[PDB]
Amino acid sequence: MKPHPWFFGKIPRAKAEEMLSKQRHDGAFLIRESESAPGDFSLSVKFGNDVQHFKVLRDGAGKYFLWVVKFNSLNELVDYHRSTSVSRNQQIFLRDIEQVP
Numbered sequence: 001m002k003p004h005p006w007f008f009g010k011i012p013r014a015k016a017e018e019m020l021s022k023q024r025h026d027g028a029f030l031i032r033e034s035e036s037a038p039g040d041f042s043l044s045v046k047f048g049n050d051v052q053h054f055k056v057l058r059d060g061a062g063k064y065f066l067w068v069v070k071f072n073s074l075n076e077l078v079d080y081h082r083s084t085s086v087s088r089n090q091q092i093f094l095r096d097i098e099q100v101p
């Protein structure tokens with residue numbers, strides 16, 4: 001149907017921070033392909049004047065997770081975290097970034 005506005009591919013950790021620092025709302029995020037760990041994904045989220053980074057972990061079957069609950073896709077991981085916090089220190093819910101039209 002429509003492509004996801006959150007997949008940025010191989011953008012540096014620093015480029016994710018540059019982009020997200022311009023976003024107004026907390027929870028504004030992106031999924032990127034890690035450069036420090038090739039083959040692994042990373043989640044970058046906006047919170048205040050900072051950008052929090054999370055590593056997308058894998059189990060033995062290749063399922064994705066951030067903490068405990070695991071999923072069959074990055075798509076389901078992202079969607080679950082729109083209603084359950086990505087952080088254990090703050091209530092940060094994932095919301096789509098405000099794109100340059």
Ligand SMILES: CNC(=O)C[C@@H](Cc1ccc(OP(=O)(O)O)cc1)C(=O)N[C@@H](CCC(N)=O)C(=O)N[C@@H](CC(N)=O)C(N)=O
Nearest residue numbers: 013034035036037041042052053054055056057065066067
């Ligand atoms: C300053 N340390 C970090 O940024 C590492 C970060 C996880 C992390 C580690 C490496 C990394 O490399 P790259 O950006 O892809 O090149 C990206 C993210 C973390 O610990 N994130 C925190 C959550 C955000 C924060 N409080 O700064 C955490 O507890 N993460 C959990 C859960 C997770 N899945 O990341 C963990 N470390 O297992």
Ligand SMILES: [Cl-]
Nearest residue numbers: 023024025098
């Ligand atoms: Cl914005």
Ligand SMILES: [Cl-]
Nearest residue numbers: 036037040055
């Ligand atoms: Cl690590």
Ligand SMILES: [Cl-]
Nearest residue numbers: 083084085091
């Ligand atoms: Cl929650």
Ligand SMILES: [Mg+2]
Nearest residue numbers: 004075076079
């Ligand atoms: Mg979806």
